[PDB]
Design a protein around this motif. Structure first.
Motif, mmCIF file in Angstrom:
data_model
loop_
_atom_site.group_PDB
_atom_site.id
_atom_site.type_symbol
_atom_site.label_atom_id
_atom_site.label_comp_id
_atom_site.label_asym_id
_atom_site.label_seq_id
_atom_site.Cartn_x
_atom_site.Cartn_y
_atom_site.Cartn_z
ATOM 1 N N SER A 28 0.843 -1.202 0.000
ATOM 2 C CA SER A 28 0.000 0.000 0.000
ATOM 3 C C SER A 28 0.878 1.251 0.000
ATOM 4 C CB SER A 28 -0.959 0.043 1.192
ATOM 5 O OG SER A 28 -0.348 0.620 2.335
ATOM 6 N N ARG A 29 1.866 1.220 0.884
ATOM 7 C CA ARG A 29 2.822 2.322 1.040
ATOM 8 C C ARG A 29 3.540 2.592 -0.294
ATOM 9 N NH1 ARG A 29 3.818 2.617 6.727
ATOM 10 N NH2 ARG A 29 1.675 2.868 7.532
ATOM 11 N N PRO A 50 4.158 3.505 -3.946
ATOM 12 C CA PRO A 50 3.399 4.367 -4.851
ATOM 13 C C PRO A 50 3.160 3.677 -6.174
ATOM 14 C CG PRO A 50 5.697 4.999 -4.912
ATOM 15 C CD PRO A 50 5.585 3.898 -3.900
ATOM 16 N N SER A 51 2.044 4.013 -6.803
ATOM 17 C CA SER A 51 1.495 3.224 -7.904
ATOM 18 C C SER A 51 2.465 3.074 -9.066
ATOM 19 C CB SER A 51 0.197 3.847 -8.418
ATOM 20 O OG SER A 51 0.408 5.189 -8.827
ATOM 21 N N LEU A 79 -4.644 1.028 -5.091
ATOM 22 C CA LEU A 79 -5.861 1.427 -4.382
ATOM 23 C C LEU A 79 -6.443 0.235 -3.623
ATOM 24 C CD1 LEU A 79 -7.920 4.145 -6.304
ATOM 25 C CD2 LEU A 79 -5.941 4.400 -4.773
ATOM 26 N N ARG A 99 -4.397 -0.672 -0.653
ATOM 27 C CA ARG A 99 -4.662 0.320 0.398
ATOM 28 C C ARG A 99 -5.930 -0.051 1.156
ATOM 29 N NH1 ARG A 99 -2.423 4.101 -3.304
ATOM 30 N NH2 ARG A 99 -0.168 3.933 -2.792
ATOM 31 N N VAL A 100 -6.954 -0.375 0.375
ATOM 32 C CA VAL A 100 -8.266 -0.758 0.910
ATOM 33 C C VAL A 100 -8.125 -1.970 1.830
ATOM 34 C CG1 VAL A 100 -10.470 -1.856 0.295
ATOM 35 C CG2 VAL A 100 -9.810 0.328 -0.712
ATOM 36 N N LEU A 144 -15.583 -2.467 -3.880
ATOM 37 C CA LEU A 144 -14.758 -1.421 -4.486
ATOM 38 C C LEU A 144 -13.935 -2.001 -5.624
ATOM 39 C CD1 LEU A 144 -13.462 -0.295 -1.041
ATOM 40 C CD2 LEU A 144 -15.050 1.070 -2.438
ATOM 41 N N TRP A 174 -13.814 -1.205 -9.614
ATOM 42 C CA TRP A 174 -12.539 -0.854 -10.250
ATOM 43 C C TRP A 174 -12.313 -1.699 -11.487
ATOM 44 C CZ3 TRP A 174 -9.837 -0.426 -4.975
ATOM 45 C CH2 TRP A 174 -10.068 0.861 -4.451
ATOM 46 N N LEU A 224 14.230 3.532 -1.872
ATOM 47 C CA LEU A 224 14.225 4.963 -1.580
ATOM 48 C C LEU A 224 15.627 5.374 -1.084
ATOM 49 C CD1 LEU A 224 11.152 4.667 0.849
ATOM 50 C CD2 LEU A 224 10.904 5.059 -1.624
ATOM 51 N N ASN A 249 -0.743 9.260 -4.364
ATOM 52 C CA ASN A 249 0.488 8.562 -4.614
ATOM 53 C C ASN A 249 1.669 9.472 -4.393
ATOM 54 O OD1 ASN A 249 -1.349 6.755 -7.060
ATOM 55 N ND2 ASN A 249 -0.627 5.930 -5.130
ATOM 56 N N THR A 295 2.089 10.061 -0.746
ATOM 57 C CA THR A 295 2.679 8.856 -0.161
ATOM 58 C C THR A 295 4.194 8.870 -0.340
ATOM 59 O OG1 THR A 295 0.647 7.587 -0.431
ATOM 60 C CG2 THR A 295 2.711 6.364 -0.287
ATOM 61 N N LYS A 296 4.589 9.190 -1.566
ATOM 62 C CA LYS A 296 6.006 9.266 -1.953
ATOM 63 C C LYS A 296 6.732 10.265 -1.081
ATOM 64 C CE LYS A 296 6.223 10.031 -6.543
ATOM 65 N NZ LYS A 296 5.119 9.563 -7.415
ATOM 66 N N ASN A 330 7.329 8.992 2.360
ATOM 67 C CA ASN A 330 8.427 8.018 2.299
ATOM 68 C C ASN A 330 9.772 8.736 2.315
ATOM 69 O OD1 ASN A 330 6.464 5.706 0.295
ATOM 70 N ND2 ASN A 330 6.788 5.740 2.521
ATOM 71 N N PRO A 344 -14.351 6.347 -2.597
ATOM 72 C CA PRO A 344 -14.356 5.687 -1.284
ATOM 73 C C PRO A 344 -13.226 6.113 -0.348
ATOM 74 C CG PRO A 344 -13.661 4.178 -3.028
ATOM 75 C CD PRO A 344 -14.204 5.388 -3.704
ATOM 76 N N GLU A 375 -11.607 4.976 1.967
ATOM 77 C CA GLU A 375 -10.568 4.020 2.368
ATOM 78 C C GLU A 375 -9.360 3.985 1.423
ATOM 79 O OE1 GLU A 375 -14.787 2.970 2.488
ATOM 80 O OE2 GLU A 375 -13.437 2.199 0.942
ATOM 81 N N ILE A 376 -9.480 4.584 0.235
ATOM 82 C CA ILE A 376 -8.312 4.797 -0.634
ATOM 83 C C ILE A 376 -7.363 5.825 -0.011
ATOM 84 C CG2 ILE A 376 -9.685 4.225 -2.670
ATOM 85 C CD1 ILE A 376 -9.881 7.051 -3.456
ATOM 86 N N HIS A 428 -4.783 5.234 4.347
ATOM 87 C CA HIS A 428 -3.406 4.837 4.636
ATOM 88 C C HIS A 428 -2.513 6.036 4.999
ATOM 89 C CE1 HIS A 428 -2.418 6.388 0.641
ATOM 90 N NE2 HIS A 428 -1.142 6.207 0.935
ATOM 91 N N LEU A 479 -2.243 7.092 8.566
ATOM 92 C CA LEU A 479 -1.441 6.092 9.284
ATOM 93 C C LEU A 479 0.046 6.367 9.071
ATOM 94 C CD1 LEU A 479 -4.183 5.004 9.784
ATOM 95 C CD2 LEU A 479 -3.558 2.904 8.565
ATOM 96 N N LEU A 480 0.381 6.611 7.808
ATOM 97 C CA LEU A 480 1.758 6.887 7.399
ATOM 98 C C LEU A 480 2.291 8.113 8.147
ATOM 99 C CD1 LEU A 480 4.311 6.304 5.860
ATOM 100 C CD2 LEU A 480 3.199 7.091 3.754
ATOM 101 N N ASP A 499 2.955 7.393 11.736
ATOM 102 C CA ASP A 499 4.197 6.622 11.815
ATOM 103 C C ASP A 499 5.422 7.496 11.511
ATOM 104 O OD1 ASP A 499 3.910 3.586 12.428
ATOM 105 O OD2 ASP A 499 2.243 3.959 11.048
#
Lengths: 415, 140, 143, 216, 46, 121, 124
Positions: free
Chosen positions: A210-211, A213-214, A270, A273-274, A287, A291, C39, G36, G39-40, G43, G58, G60-61, G64, G67-68, G71
């Motif tokens: 999830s962390r 990136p896409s 995505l 992540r869900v 979801l 998708w 990274l 994204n 997120t990057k 990181n 939604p 929930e996308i 995260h 949370l990140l 942390d």
């Protein structure tokens, strides 16, 4: 038993030192069939525990690191005997296998089974790869018996350990795959269970994935990009990697694969992540469905082309000479499209005289014309027929941009 | 093409067509439906028609059906086209020596378009004749 | 054992003082541990940007490379560091180590060793604290 | 002979029309014409013609038609080429058409060959490669050939080389009095290279180092 | 002379519905011809 | 290895060199050198070129003995085309012929049929 | 009405301030739109604070990112409108997450710091 694995993890961290690891290696060896066997057994056994992860989410990156270290060590051992092997064969297990094959001896100088062994014994080796390996051998592989027997022994040991590690990793991956319909259901739905397992395993856990990136997801499971190996596909898809080999992409035409792949990456991310968000025993997976549907739609759209254009009509031919303009401003632009004075001169040809040509090696035909003054022509050449600055081939907007980009890149490289 | 280009039914219709386009030029293919050359011409003209919709309209005519216009060619009756503007018949001097009608297939779509354009221009000027930009001589 | 905490601390430090090279070095070291193993290059680049190719950051990078065992790269990094500021110590030691690891010889290094050492450099400084010589010290460090 | 294809197209269309003498049929016929054309176009390209909504029998018919065209078309093209070679007789646009058609078929063959190669690996069995690589290497050894290094950053005979390169590129345009767009662009690029020579050199070397993906 | 396709035509006639005929996918240029035309023409806009 | 486009029909050049890339001539030549070597054999190639320190002018040699050593007197290659001038003392030629026969049988004597000849003359 | 799990949702004025900062950040190339990218940033460590969207559906996308941040010890908010956020960033399209990044030498450093402080205050 169940209690072993934090100890295992700890052991794995002790290897995280640097090459040469020697006494460390010996320690490492000890650490190996102690731990890299019991774990396998546990995996094999069903209903030992369902919460092995996230302690196996903690360990897989460690394992990966260990494997990398081992590979490095192997390369160090072999380099100066055969430097290019690392370059050619990047995959660490594969490399190890190759080394093992190489060592084997007996009928190996002519052909064992030499080029037979690679395809079969080191299962991964593709024809292209094999050819390059052969080439390397012909050039750079010294094939004098190993510096010492001790060295050979060490390399063998390394191979054994590395292989074991690889096996363990594979087992872990398999386990994950078996589980993931429970772990990361959305992701599985999006892609397919094996693929999900591969991705997830690579990441660490689901959280790790999830962390990620896409844009990166794409090139997980890519075979190390070699300079020498060809790349451009009809697809236009630079990445390949686990996702690209999914049903979701690979069913559609190659036209769409790049865009489709891109779409998948983001949607996969995505989904991951869900999954991470969800608590165990929720298994929503609506979801993901949505998708998937969207992805399908996108694919369809990409495959379908534009409806035929109503053939654009030729304009009612009227022959208007309305314009009539000029301006320091406007006369520049029009200068680019004017025939310039030297060109006009050239177009003039002296009557009686044989006219001055130029012998371009491409074609002699060219008439320099009466741009060169008679006397001047008789004597020599002229930059008097190099007058104009207003029609000196400028770039396009696009071209200019591209050149700028190139320059920037060059600058970066220099720094 | 059969579906693409409109075909005319009877001499009256043809006459109407010739008259009515004040703005555009009118190209009437006079030809026997099932003939090779005629078919080819039709095919060519289908392509052209869409392109030149803005300045010239194309129409087809089964010459064995509509016998009213055997004044137009003196009962020779090859597979022809004819050109009209403001109900005035438009003469186009090719190499052929029949300046009245092109009674020969030209294979280049672009060439055909160009000739159409030329004749339109001539019509606009009022010039009953016009010299084609392509010589021919060979086709006839 | 605690690494997440360390990382957090480093981040905090960066937030407070971004340009400080020691913090960057620490971060690099942490990265080298191999939780991310990724990274990594980007992080290095960032460090370089912030610290303006600081002598120490380069050295740290080189060390990391050495640890990972891409040796040519490490050597290059070390060279760069030296160029940036030769007087600093630990860099020299690292270079020597690299040389030892490879087949290259130390004569050149010796020739170029005319310049100073214990002015700056942590390990070197420590060694000094623990004496009067230079080559002997270097040898000890290598050992 | 070139008319044959046209005839086929017409005839097929007529047949289709006959098969569906429905309401609002003219429009349908027109649509079908386009479909017919498009299939042919696809074939020419060597793209597959896989229309989703198309009903089976119609699709089949279309496919058959295109096959027929191919049979007629390719052969016809070949014949034309032969005629041209002979120096027999040919229309001044017909030849041009053939050259297009012929080109397309060449492309199709070559691309098919490539596809085949991709499918079934390189024709060089590794033994052969070993033999021939070996031969080259031995030759090199015999010659004691110092390999060509990467063009240095401050290369001695660099500027001259660049100049030479530019001149050759130019050579094509020296004669011509106008320029299309592409040509103009090329000229501009050349000028830029000349004028910022150092920059151009840097770009080139960078490309050599790193560029491995290219405008097609 | 139009003998190879007759059977096919017959089959088509037998099979198709009116609804099906109505809902033929008015076809898109797979070889993206108009785009190409736009591009080349632009390049060689004289 | 580029995408080769053409009037809406692409492919990807995974195999077989593109001749239009400016360097490609050089590459082609290099490739043909390999083939040339194969044709000649290493030793014969060496004889032809001469030593590396002091190479030969085209078709020359360091001696009349090294010219007469191998069957391949003169070799050259204009691009795809190659030109080899063999010279056999009778016996060697005969042997070669015999070998050929052994490999590739010829009972009917229909080998003069097929054999290409310079119909220009 | 906004999602419960979208927390902390910024108060009107605060939200506005955040948006303004983002806009400034956008202008300065200090900002990074999107899940994204955000997120990057996290990181990397470049993120100063993360701005999310409550009306992300939604949700929930998104979830995260928080949370990140937790942390990483990075302030984070939700604003209410994704559309608004997008506009601020300079994108007509719905953006759901963003990161204002670190750059000491920025003009808007102070502003950014203020916003961060506010965000921290919100959290508990």
């Amino acid at each position: 038993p169940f209690e072993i694995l934090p100890e295992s993890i700890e052991l794995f961290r002790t290897l995280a030192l640097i090459s040469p690891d020697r006494l460390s290696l010996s320690e490492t060896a000890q650490i190996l069939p102690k731990i890299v066997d019991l774990k396998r057994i546990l995996q094999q056994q069903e209903i030992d525990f369902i919460k092995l992860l996230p302690f196996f989410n903690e360990i897989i990156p460690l394992i990966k690191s260990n494997i990398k270290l081992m590979h490095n060590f192997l390369i160090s051992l072999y380099s100066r005997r055969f430097p290019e092997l690392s370059s050619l064969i990047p995959s660490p297990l594969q490399y190890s296998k190759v080394i093992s094959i190489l060592e084997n001896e007996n009928y190996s100088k002519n052909e064992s089974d030499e080029l037979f062994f690679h395809l079969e014994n080191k299962a991964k080796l593709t024809r292209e790869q094999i050819l390059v390996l052969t080439m390397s051998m012909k050039t750079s592989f010294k094939n004098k018996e190993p510096l010492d027997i001790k060295t050979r022994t060490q390399i063998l040991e390394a191979n054994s350990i590395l292989e074991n590690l690889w096996k363990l990793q594979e087992d872990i991956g398999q386990y994950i795959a078996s589980k993931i319909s429970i772990i990361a259901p959305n992701v599985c739905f999006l892609v397919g269970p094996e693929i999900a397992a591969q991705l997830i395993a690579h990441a660490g856990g689901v959280l790790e994935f999830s962390r990620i990136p896409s844009c990166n997801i794409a090139s997980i499971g890519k075979n190390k990009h070699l300079s020498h190996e060809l790349h451009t596909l009809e697809s236009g898809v630079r990445q390949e990697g686990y996702l690209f080999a999914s049903d979701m992409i690979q069913k559609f035409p190659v036209s769409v694969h790049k865009q489709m792949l891109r779409m998948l990456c983001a949607k996969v991310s995505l989904a991951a992540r869900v999954d991470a968000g969800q608590k165990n025993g929720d298994r929503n997976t609506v979801l993901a469905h949505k998708w998937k549907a969207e992805l399908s739609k996108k694919a369809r759209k990409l495959s379908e082309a534009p409806s035929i254009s109503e053939t654009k009509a030729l304009p009612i031919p009227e022959d208007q000479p309305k314009k009539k303009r000029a301006g320091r401003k406007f006369r520049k632009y029009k200068e680019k499209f004017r025939l310039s004075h030297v060109r006009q001169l050239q177009n003039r040809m002296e009557f009686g005289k044989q006219e001055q040509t130029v012998l371009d090696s491409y074609g002699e035909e060219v008439g320099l014309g009466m741009s060169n003054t008679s006397l001047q022509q008789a004597v020599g050449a002229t930059s008097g027929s190099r007058r104009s600055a207003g029609n000196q081939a400028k770039l396009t907007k696009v071209m200019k941009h591209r050149i700028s980009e190139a320059n920037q890149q060059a600058d970066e490289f220099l720094i | 093409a059969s579906v693409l280009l409109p075909q005319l039914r009877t001499g009256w219709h043809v006459d109407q067509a010739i008259v009515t386009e004040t703005k555009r030029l009118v190209v009437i293919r006079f030809g026997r439906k099932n003939d090779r050359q005629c078919m080819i011409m039709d095919e060519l003209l289908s392509s052209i028609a869409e392109r030149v919709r803005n300045f010239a309209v194309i129409y087809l005519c089964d010459i064995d059906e509509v016998s009213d216009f055997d004044e137009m060619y003196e009962l020779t009756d090859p597979m022809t086209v004819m050109f009209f503007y403001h109900n005035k018949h438009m003469m186009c001097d090719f190499g052929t020596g029949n300046n009245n009608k092109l009674n020969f297939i030209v294979d280049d779509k672009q060439e055909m378009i160009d000739i159409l354009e030329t004749i339109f221009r001539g019509a606009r000027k009022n010039k009953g004749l016009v010299v084609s930009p392509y010589d021919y001589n060979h086709k006839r | 054992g605690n690494l997440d905490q360390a990382e957090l601390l480093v981040t905090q430090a960066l937030q407070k003082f971004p340009s400080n090279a020691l913090l960057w070095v620490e971060q690099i070291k942490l990265f080298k541990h191999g939780n991310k193993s990724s990274l990594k290059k980007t992080i290095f680049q960032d460090a370089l940007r912030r610290t303006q190719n600081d002598h120490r950051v380069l050295l740290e990078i080189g060390v990391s490379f050495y640890a990972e065992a891409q040796y040519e790269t490490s050597l290059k990094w070390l060279e760069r560091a030296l160029k940036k500021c030769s007087r600093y110590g630990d860099t020299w030691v690292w270079l020597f180590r690299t040389y030892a690891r490879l087949g290259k010889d130390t004569v050149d290094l010796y020739n170029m060793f005319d310049q100073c050492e214990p002015t700056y450099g942590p390990e070197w400084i420590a060694a000094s604290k623990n004496c009067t010589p230079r080559e002997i010290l270097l040898r000890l460090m290598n050992d | 002979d070139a008319y044959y294809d046209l005839e086929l197209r017409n005839s097929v269309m007529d047949d289709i029309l006959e098969m569906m003498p429905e309401s609002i049929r003219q429009k349908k016929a027109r649509t079908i014409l386009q479909h017919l054309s498009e299939a042919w176009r696809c074939w020419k390209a060597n793209i597959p013609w896989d229309v989703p909504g198309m009903p089976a029998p119609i699709k089949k018919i279309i496919e058959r038609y295109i096959k027929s065209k191919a049979d007629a078309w390719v052969s016809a093209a070949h014949y034309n080429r032969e005629r041209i070679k002979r120096g027999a007789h040919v229309e001044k646009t017909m030849v041009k058409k053939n050259l297009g058609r012929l080109t397309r078929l060449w492309i199709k063959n070559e691309q098919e060959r490539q596809r085949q190669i991709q499918k079934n690996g390189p024709e060089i069995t590794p033994e052969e490669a070993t033999t021939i690589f070996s031969v080259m290497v031995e030759w090199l050894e015999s010659r004691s050939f110092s390999p060509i290094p990467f063009p240095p950053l401050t290369y001695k005979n660099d500027t001259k080389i660049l100049v030479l390169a530019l001149e050759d590129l130019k050579d094509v345009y020296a004669s011509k009095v106008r320029l299309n767009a592409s040509e103009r662009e090329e000229l501009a690029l050349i000028e830029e290279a000349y004028d910022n020579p150092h920059d151009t050199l840097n770009r080139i070397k960078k490309y050599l180092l790193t560029q491995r993906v290219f405008k097609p | 002379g139009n003998v190879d396709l007759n059977k096919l035509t017959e089959e088509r006639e037998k099979l198709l519905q009116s609804q099906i005929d109505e809902n033929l996918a008015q076809l898109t240029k797979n070889a993206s011809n108009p785009i190409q035309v736009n591009k080349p023409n632009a390049a060689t806009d004289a | 290895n580029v995408v080769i486009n053409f009037k809406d029909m692409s492919h990807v050049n995974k195999y077989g060199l593109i001749r239009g890339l400016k360097f490609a001539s050089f590459i082609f030549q290099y490739y043909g050198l390999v083939i040339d070597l194969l044709l000649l054999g290493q030793e014969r190639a060496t004889d032809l070129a001469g030593p590396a320190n002091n190479p030969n002018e085209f078709m020359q040699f360091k001696s009349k003995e090294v010219e007469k050593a191998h069957p391949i007197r003169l070799y050259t290659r204009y691009l795809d085309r190659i030109y080899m001038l063999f010279h056999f003392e009778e016996d060697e030629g005969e042997e070669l012929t015999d070998e050929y026969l052994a490999e590739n049988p010829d009972p009917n004597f229909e080998n003069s049929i097929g054999y290409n000849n310079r119909k220009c003359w | 009405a906004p999602n419960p799990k979208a927390f902390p949702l910024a108060d009107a004025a605060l939200t506005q301030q955040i948006l303004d900062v983002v806009q400034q950040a956008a202008n300065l190339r200090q900002l990074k739109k999107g899940a994204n990218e955000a997120t990057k940033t996290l990181n990397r460590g470049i993120s100063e604070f993360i701005i999310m969207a409550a009306d992300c559906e939604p949700i929930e996308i998104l979830l995260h990112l928080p949370l990140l941040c937790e942390d990483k010890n990075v302030p984070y908010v939700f604003v209410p409108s994704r559309v608004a956020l997008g506009r601020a960033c300079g994108v007509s399209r719905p953006v759901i997450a963003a990161s204002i990044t670190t750059n000491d030498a920025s003009a808007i450093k102070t502003q950014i710091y203020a916003v961060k402080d506010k965000i921290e205050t919100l959290l508990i």
